[PDB]
Design a protein around this ligand. Structure first.
Ligand SMILES: Nc1ncnc2c1ncn2[C@@H]1O[C@H](COP(=O)(O)OP(=O)(O)OP(O)(O)=S)[C@@H](O)[C@H]1O
Ligand SMILES: [Mg+2]
Lengths: 273, 364, 104, 574
């Protein structure tokens, strides 16, 4: 999958229609801002990567106000991290919190006491694996229930409507907009995690390399019993005592290398290489 | 006062002996629900005027609460806070040295002890052998509904004296119910009321509390005919249907359109094996997709997959009508179970004009 | 209910059971008899079963809740046939019909 | 800066201007004022429609607490309308703290998974109503008393775990003497569920009593009658929007707040779209300040142009050239439209009063059905109208005069401007019945006419129903399938116009990949799929084609159409 890094040389097709499509999409920003500012939260749904449109909207209209961007497609994001970021910067508070619910209570009380605070949220790929928790969406909806917070979200998964319940629907107060941009999902697939054997075996002792080669050969022929494997290793004179063979087996185990959990085709290609 | 309770009271009084005398370290009393364990022991303790601490296990759901409540009540009989059982033993030894507590037995009544076996491993053995450790003329009583056979720890401990409270009978129940007669009418009237009530309900309801509650509820209707103007036949004829209606309930005391179709489809998916599904729906010859296909087949009109149907699904899940089986994080292959009674689904199908029995594979 | 449970244990050798089978065979017993006074509905029998489980004469297997209701739950009896017979012999006012059903 | 490893990014640096202008300002002001009035009336109705139960609750609580001077408990059935509850509950506490007791504590099931947290929240809210254990609560009550009871509200017991419930009940049973306690239950399903939650050993300690709440259908009918069939609001709605909102309500939620939100969105869109929506006396005075561009916009209206076509050529020239004459004529037409609205509402209400007692309800039971079937087409042109008339012609005299008495009550209440002789004749009354039926039919023919038949209706009507559908009831699967199958509708590229279901090779990689996936089996072999994709795109190169295939596969896997399997290497299910 390393070849992916070199695959970016392919040129796009029919880019003129995409240009007109983006120009048509650009004109809805004022209406979206008006709908946000009256107490509505907006979801964007449609085919194609819509990150570019959101970034354009931010850099065009949100350069004069406080705004927080969370690109949830990163698999390391959690709601507690968002809460900590809000507390540390929006309110500039450093004190730790005993529980998530207590942090939510503090934030709600602070925002209710201070009516001069306005915050904008820009969430990318709200359907992330880490944000699908019921408590996560409950927390986000409770946050969005305030009249001093504006929410723009994006949907890219098919089963998104199952996330929201009737009470959650009432809390979120959603409006929908269809914006299909046809953009490739380069960045959003970049962080996602869908050679090693050669590098490991390069610096290992040649006896271990031969033993592993024999093990691969037997595995491709048809798991070995310990006794038969020891006898065959004896026959090749790569082992002088069973303690040494078990030491080599433990060395292989330490690298997570009896069955080898490696695909047959990869082993066949590696043997000749 | 106590009625039909004279053997157990005499046995307990003989057991206690004199105040300066010693007694058993542990007595385990067990009986039925309406045997009156709490009433008899508390009345006896009040009558004998003994230093006793009454404790509910349920109220003291934590060890610290239990020990602190015991110590505070004992001190009030004569603030203290303790945390460990050894500290409780030491503080009990310190506090028991009062002159009023010098040559007298101390009683710790515990009720609802069934939860004690779920609190700590060594708490029950420690409570059993309290008199050895304290050596201060201490007695501990137990009240429970479960037999002693299930209270035995694996290691074995000091066996308490086991006691049983006798079960009630027709005469005893009638006497107890007829004791607290209302003053505004004759005693024989209330006795006849109790007699007919027992003759109607003794087959099922033997609970004294429940039967007394039923009598209290139904007496006003009993006394109406004489007010309207000792006629046994007249009263019985006037009163029988009301008694039957009351016996109908001894222990008891509008969905949206598409929701009905979702519910019936879920019931069909749950109670009909998959192999026969096409046999009932395919025109020619559980997971979410199966439910969607069944719903699409049943409804005569083309329903668009609007998010509102998913909102209905989630709302039904919340209302505890459909149970989620799989992991909450896995919202692409979810599993569901239907928990609706068959009479309810038949009624809703009748309100929908749908014949579910024609499709139930098990009935066919 | 206990006699029905014993009959279930005899017919199905050492297997669990639920509320529905017991209810069905109790209904069979009360329907075979012409007009005996045992016309009871589902909720009262359900409450009686709950009380029996509360007294810990019946224990669940592989305990779970929510996924399985009180109904359709695998129950087992914690008594022996000779114990039931001896206890029934000393019952004060056991009716003839239930005694003969127990013998059958 | 928005592409780093850390997913948390944060940045630091008038209402009407976002709507753009004087017409825009006036439209925004009218929007705000009308929304204020509408929600105020909604709150008024919400408070009004629960007295007959609030008084019952107050008297029940008074009776229960009289004995204290067995735990009293009231069961309240509230239906599936999960959105309504909170609002009602608001008013609920506003009764109790005003009348009987200043101690009301409502609790959730989400925030009380364990009894420790339950008691913690309970005591925390009791603290500001004016380890934690029952002794502490008793001491607090003794201190604050040194006798008002305490009120606890359980909202959603379905989510409550049983064990905490039985524990709390059994603990509170033994301390009733120490402090009074009363429970309020909120049950969404039938009350029978209470028997399935509490074992009888615990249930025997409660004296439960049952109340029932208002049905949602009556609530909707009252709201519709008070807010749309009245003359106090200038805004009106076409039939399509009414039908779609009624469908959503009756088929989805039985909730009124969703209907209110739809109405608000309709109002916002109507004031955003039509510049002429700036427009009783307010419009009368605003006509004088009209602008020439707005004059031309008025000149462009379809109903206006049909009305101009109706009049003579000289009047046509006078309207098309003069401005003040146009203003005066539009003023007269607006007054005529107002009169039409008045008499339409009155006549429809009287007709529904006549129809309400008809057996089998040929034209419905409530206001909404008759109103929408009148809005659709002319009633008199349908044979069902004749059937209704001939069924009316069979009424008995006593029921007929009772119906006439109800209609006379309607006339004396709010039929104030026209045809008191109708009520006089009703007082005067087969021949008479036939005369009454014929007179009612004449009224129906004269006054029941579609508002679309009159000019300048577009000022007070909205018609973009499909936009409302797409902005409230989204169809992500349908839109995604349309994008995947026939991208021509999004691109207008003639190369994609071949057939339906055939394979346009010119289509982008994702579309052709999805279409190839569709025709294959339920398990997709990746190598065979790649070979097919290469064959399709064919009609250095190999690596580029493989790159496009991998990118398309990853995209489809992200969208959820792909779930991999380990049973067979390189296979995926749908
Ligand atoms: N032998 C009795 N004589 C007089 N009254 C009795 C007798 N037994 C019970 N009662 C009355 O019945 C009431 C209820 O009985 P309980 O004392 O609750 O029974 P119990 O054995 O303590 O069961 P638990 O532990 O409370 S579940 C008592 O409060 C008494 O008023
Ligand atoms: Mg008791």
């Amino acid at each position: 999958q390393t070849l992916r890094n070199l695959l970016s040389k392919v040129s796009p097709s029919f880019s003129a229609e995409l240009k007109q499509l983006n120009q048509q999409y650009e004109k809805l920003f004022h209406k979206w801002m008006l709908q946000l500012h009256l107490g509505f939260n907006i979801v964007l749904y449609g085919l194609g990567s819509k990150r570019d449109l959101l970034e354009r909207f931010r850099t065009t209209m949100l350069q004069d106000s406080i705004h927080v961007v969370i690109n949830g497609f990163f698999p390391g994001i959690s709601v507690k991290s968002v809460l900590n970021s809000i507390t540390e910067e929006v309110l500039d508070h450093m004190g730790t919190f005993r529980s998530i619910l207590d942090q939510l209570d503090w934030i709600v009380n602070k925002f209710k006491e201070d009516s001069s605070l306005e915050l904008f949220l820009l969430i990318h790929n709200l359907d992330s694996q880490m944000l699908r928790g019921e408590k996560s969406q409950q927390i986000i909806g409770q946050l969005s229930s305030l009249h001093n917070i504006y929410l723009i979200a994006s949907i890219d998964h098919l089963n998104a409507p199952l996330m929201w319940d009737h009470a959650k629907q009432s809390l979120f107060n959603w409006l929908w907009y269809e914006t299909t941009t046809y953009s490739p999902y380069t960045e959003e697939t970049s962080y996602e995690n869908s050679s090693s054997l050669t590098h490991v075996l390069r610096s290992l002792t040649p006896n271990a390399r031969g033993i592993f080669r024999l093990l691969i050969k037997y595995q491709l022929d048809n798991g070995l019993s310990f006794q038969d494997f020891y006898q065959q290793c004896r026959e090749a004179f790569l082992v002088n005592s069973d303690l040494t063979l078990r030491a080599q087996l433990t060395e292989f185990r330490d690298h997570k290398l009896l069955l080898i959990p490696v695909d047959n085709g990869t082993l066949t290609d590696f043997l000749e290489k | 006062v106590v009625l039909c309770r004279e053997s157990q009271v005499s046995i307990l009084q003989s057991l206690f002996g004199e105040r300066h005398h010693f007694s058993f370290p542990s007595i385990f009393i067990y009986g039925h629900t309406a045997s009156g364990k709490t009433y008899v022991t508390q009345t006896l303790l009040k009558t004998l005027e003994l230093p006793h601490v009454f404790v509910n296990c349920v109220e003291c759901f934590t060890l610290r609460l239990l020990l602190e409540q015991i110590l505070n009540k004992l001190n009030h009989l004569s603030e203290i806070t303790c945390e460990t059982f050894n500290d409780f033993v030491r503080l009990f030894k310190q506090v028991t040295t009062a002159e009023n507590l010098k040559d007298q037995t101390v009683y710790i009544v515990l009720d609802k002890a069934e939860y004690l076996r779920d609190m700590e491993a060594n708490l029950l053995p420690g409570f059993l052998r309290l008199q050895e450790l304290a050596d201060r003329n201490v007695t501990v009583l137990f009240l429970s509904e479960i037999v002693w056979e299930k209270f035995r720890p694996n290691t074995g401990c000091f066996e308490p004296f086991v006691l049983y409270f006798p079960d009630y009978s027709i005469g005893n129940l009638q006497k107890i119910l007829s004791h607290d007669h209302p003053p505004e009418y004759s005693a024989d009237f209330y006795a006849a009321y109790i007699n007919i009530l027992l003759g109607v309900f003794y087959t099922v309801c033997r609970d004294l509390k429940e039967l007394r509650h039923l009598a209290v509820l139904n007496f006003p209707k009993y006394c109406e005919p004489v007010v309207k103007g000792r006629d046994t036949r007249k009263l019985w004829r006037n009163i029988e249907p009301h008694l039957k209606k009351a016996m109908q309930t001894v222990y008891l005391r509008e969905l949206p359109y598409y929701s009905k179709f979702i519910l019936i489809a879920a019931y069909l998916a749950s109670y009909n094996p998959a192999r026969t599904d096409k046999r009932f729906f395919l025109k020619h010859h559980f997971p979410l997709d199966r439910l969607l296909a069944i719903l699409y087949s049943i409804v005569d009109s083309r329903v668009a997959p609007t998010a509102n149907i998913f909102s209905q699904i989630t709302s039904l899940v919340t209302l505890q009508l459909l149970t989620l089986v799989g992991h909450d994080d896995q919202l692409d292959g979810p599993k569901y179970k239907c928990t609706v009674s068959l009479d309810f689904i038949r009624a809703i199908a009748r309100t929908v004009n749908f014949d579910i029995i024609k499709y139930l594979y098990d009935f066919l | 209910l206990i006699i029905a449970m014993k009959h279930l244990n005899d017919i199905y050798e050492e297997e669990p059971f639920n509320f529905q089978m017991v209810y069905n065979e109790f209904q069979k017993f009360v329907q075979r008899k012409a007009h005996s006074v045992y016309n009871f509905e589902k909720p009262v029998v359900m409450k009686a079963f709950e009380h029996l489980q509360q007294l810990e004469l019946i224990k669940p297997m592989e305990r779970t809740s929510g996924n399985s209701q009180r109904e359709y739950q695998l129950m087992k009896l914690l008594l022996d046939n000779t114990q039931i017979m001896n206890a029934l012999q000393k019952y004060p006012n056991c009716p003839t019909d239930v005694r003969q059903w127990a013998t059958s | 800066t928005s592409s780093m490893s850390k997913g948390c990014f944060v940045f630091k640096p008038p209402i009407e201007d976002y709507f753009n202008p004087e017409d825009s300002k006036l439209r925004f002001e009218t929007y705000q004022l009308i929304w204020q009035q509408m929600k105020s009336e909604n709150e008024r109705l919400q408070e009004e429609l629960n007295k007959n139960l609030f008084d019952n609750l107050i008297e029940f609580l008074q009776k229960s607490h009289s004995g204290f001077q067995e735990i009293p408990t009231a069961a309240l059935v509230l239906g599936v309308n999960v959105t309504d509850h909170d609002l009602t509950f608001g008013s609920l506490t506003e009764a109790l703290q005003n009348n009987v007791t200043p101690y009301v504590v409502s609790l959730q099931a989400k925030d009380c998974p364990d009894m420790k947290h339950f008691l913690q929240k309970l005591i925390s809210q009791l603290m500001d109503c004016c380890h934690y254990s029952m002794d502490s609560l008793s001491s607090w009550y003794m201190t604050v008393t040194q006798s008002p009871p305490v009120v606890v509200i359980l909202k959603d017991m379905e989510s409550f775990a049983t064990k905490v419930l039985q524990d709390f009940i059994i603990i509170s049973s033994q301390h009733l003497h120490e402090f009074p306690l009363i429970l309020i239950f909120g049950i969404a399903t039938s009350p029978i569920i209470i028997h399935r939650l509490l074992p009888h050993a615990v249930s025997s300690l409660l004296c439960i009593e049952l109340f029932q709440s208002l049905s949602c259908k009556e609530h909707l009918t009252t709201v519709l009658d008070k807010l749309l069939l009245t003359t106090q609001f200038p805004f009106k709605i076409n039939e399509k929007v009414l039908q779609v909102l009624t469908n959503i309500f009756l088929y989805h939620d039985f909730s009124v707040q969703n209907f209110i939100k739809g109405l608000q969105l309709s109002l916002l869109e109507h004031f955003y779209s039509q510049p002429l929506s700036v427009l009783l006396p307010e419009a009368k005075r605003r006509i004088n300040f009209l602008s020439n561009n707005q004059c031309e916009n008025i000149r462009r209206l379809p109903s206006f142009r049909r009305y101009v076509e109706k009049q003579a050529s000289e009047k046509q020239v006078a309207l098309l050239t003069n401005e003040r004459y146009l203003k005066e004529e539009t003023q007269l037409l607006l007054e005529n439209l107002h009169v039409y609205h008045m008499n339409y509402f009155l006549v429809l209400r009287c007709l529904h009063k006549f129809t309400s007692s008809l057996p089998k309800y040929p034209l419905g039971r409530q206001i909404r059905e008759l109103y929408c079937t009148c809005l659709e087409k002319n009633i008199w042109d349908s044979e069902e109208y004749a059937s209704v008339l001939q069924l009316l012609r069979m009424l008995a005299k006593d029921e007929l005069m009772t119906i006439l008495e109800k209609c006379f009550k309607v006339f004396k209440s709010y039929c104030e401007n026209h045809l008191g002789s109708t009520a006089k004749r009703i007082e005067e009354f087969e021949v008479l019945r036939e005369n009454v039926v014929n007179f009612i039919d004449c009224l129906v023919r004269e006054y029941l006419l579609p508002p679309e038949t009159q000019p300048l209706h577009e000022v007070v009507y909205f018609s973009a129903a499909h936009a409302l559908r797409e902005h409230l009831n989204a169809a992500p699967r349908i839109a995604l399938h349309t994008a995947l199958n026939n991208p021509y509708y999004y691109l207008k590229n003639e190369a994609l116009k071949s057939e339906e279901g055939c394979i346009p090779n010119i289509a982008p990689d994702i579309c052709i990949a999805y279409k190839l996936h569709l025709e294959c089996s339920r398990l997709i072999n990746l190598v065979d799929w790649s070979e097919a994709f290469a064959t399709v795109v064919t009609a250095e190169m190999n690596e580029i084609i493989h790159a496009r295939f991998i990118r398309a596969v990853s995209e489809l896997e992200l969208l959820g159409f792909i779930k991999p399997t380990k049973q067979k290497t390189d296979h995926v299910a749908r």
